[PDB]
Design an enzyme around this catalytic site. Structure first.
Site, short mmCIF file in Angstrom:
data_model
loop_
_atom_site.label_atom_id
_atom_site.label_comp_id
_atom_site.label_asym_id
_atom_site.label_seq_id
_atom_site.Cartn_x
_atom_site.Cartn_y
_atom_site.Cartn_z
N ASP A 54 -25.71 13.16 1.75
CA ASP A 54 -24.62 13.23 2.70
C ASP A 54 -24.44 14.43 3.56
O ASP A 54 -24.42 15.93 3.02
CB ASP A 54 -23.42 13.00 1.94
CG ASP A 54 -22.05 13.17 2.80
OD1 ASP A 54 -22.07 12.73 3.84
OD2 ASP A 54 -20.97 13.66 2.42
N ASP A 64 -23.37 12.20 10.69
CA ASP A 64 -22.96 12.06 9.11
C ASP A 64 -23.57 10.90 8.57
O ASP A 64 -23.16 9.68 8.89
CB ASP A 64 -21.41 11.91 9.08
CG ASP A 64 -20.99 11.90 7.79
OD1 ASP A 64 -22.02 11.88 6.69
OD2 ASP A 64 -19.74 11.47 7.45
#
Length: 370
Positions: free
Chosen positions: A34, A220
């Site tokens: 992430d 992201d």
């Protein structure tokens, strides 16, 4: 770098995870990659959704930091005990480092029932780490304790079982085609970038570039869709509706709620427009652009698809939809993010995604939200 290729796995919509080991002896766990967060946290108690969990007790190199951490979300969260231990990445650089680790002992709406990952690896900066920015992130610890260059790159290939590659410490030429262009990392907290222009099928959306970054734009890998701010979303949709007006779709589709289908092999791609995002360049007044084929924002699930573009209220989010068409280089050492066409992107027979430039764009700084 060859042994790091294909070191990422996952399920469509469940993010990509890499295998990691923690403690002595080493404990194997699948960890979500992430770039949208900064903590390294692993389930450390038998939550029913987990295939496995970290067991501090069984690690001789484990050190309790005697401090708790609490990470809240929209309607859920995760909390646990802080500590450090020896961490390794089997299909990454051949090294082992002592990094901070949040042992998750309680959580809600965090783990996914049916997923194959038990933890999260936040690759963003300390600025947004919890409890505060004093808790050093994994990558920062990796760089300081070894000679691995300060950068990693991601090739998310998508399709169901998805696959990808996380090259740590370098760039792998075989993972991309064409030229590699860089945009500045505006600030070191999230991987924030600045979008200076948007075009649909070559036509400008005609909006103050600020709308594109209100109130921030980030890359992201933990988000599935390309998320655009309200105003930007509506304009984009209206424009996509017009381009594909050749057909009608229930409002529930444009909301990612209801999906559309077509006979296997008869998907009308030509009617769906290509989207172009112009990013701030490395040189004053210089920019470049990345183009997304509709195969990126229309993700599979005969042939059915869901609209993988949704509105945002927290800025633009360049997730898997965007990242899967490109090889993204997070050049931390030089505060920049590089984009190049991915060698694993899906492409039409008459249209081809791309990364190109240079372009002349004045007052790009003004595009950033203050």
């Amino acid at each position: 770098f060859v042994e790091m290729v294909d070191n990422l796995r996952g399920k469509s919509g469940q993010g990509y995870y890499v295998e990691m080991t923690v403690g002595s002896p080493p404990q194997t766990l699948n960890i979500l990659v992430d770039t949208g967060s900064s903590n390294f946290a692993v389930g450390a108690a038998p939550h029913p959704f987990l295939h496995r969990y970290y067991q501090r007790q069984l690690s001789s190199t484990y050190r309790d930091l005697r401090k708790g951490v609490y990470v809240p979300y929209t309607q859920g969260k995760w909390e646990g005990e802080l500590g450090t231990d020896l961490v390794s990445i089997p299909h990454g650089p051949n090294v082992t480092v002592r990094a901070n680790i949040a042992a998750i002992t309680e959580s809600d709406k965090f783990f996914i029932n049916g997923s194959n990952w038990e933890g999260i690896l936040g690759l963003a900066y300390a600025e947004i780490a919890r409890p505060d920015d004093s808790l050093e992130p994994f990558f920062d610890s990796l760089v300081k304790q070894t000679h691995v260059p300060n950068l990693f790159s991601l090739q998310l290939c998508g399709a169901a079982s998805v696959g990808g590659s996380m090259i740590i410490g370098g760039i792998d030429h075989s993972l991309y085609t064409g030229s590699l262009w860089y945009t500045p990392i505006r600030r070191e907290w999230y991987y924030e970038v600045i979008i200076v222009r948007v075009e649909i099928n070559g036509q400008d959306l005609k909006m103050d570039c600020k709308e594109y970054n209100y109130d921030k734009s980030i890359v992201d890998s933990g988000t599935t869709n390309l998320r655009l701010p309200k105003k930007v979303f509506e304009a984009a949709v209206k424009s996509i509706k017009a381009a594909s007006s050749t057909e009608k779709f229930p409002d529930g589709f444009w909301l990612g709620e209801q999906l559309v289908c077509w006979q296997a092999g008869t998907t009308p791609w030509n009617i769906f427009p290509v989207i172009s995002l112009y990013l701030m360049g490395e040189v004053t007044n210089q920019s470049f652009r990345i183009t997304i084929l509709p195969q990126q924002y229309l993700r599979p699930v005969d042939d059915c698809y869901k609209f993988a573009i949704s509105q945002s209220s927290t800025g633009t989010v360049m997730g898997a939809v965007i990242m899967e068409g490109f090889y993204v280089v997070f050049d931390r050492a030089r505060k920049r993010i590089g984009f190049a066409v991915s060698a694993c992107h899906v492409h039409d027979e008459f249209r081809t995604a791309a990364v190109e430039g240079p372009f002349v764009t004045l007052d790009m700084e003004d595009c950033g939200y203050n």
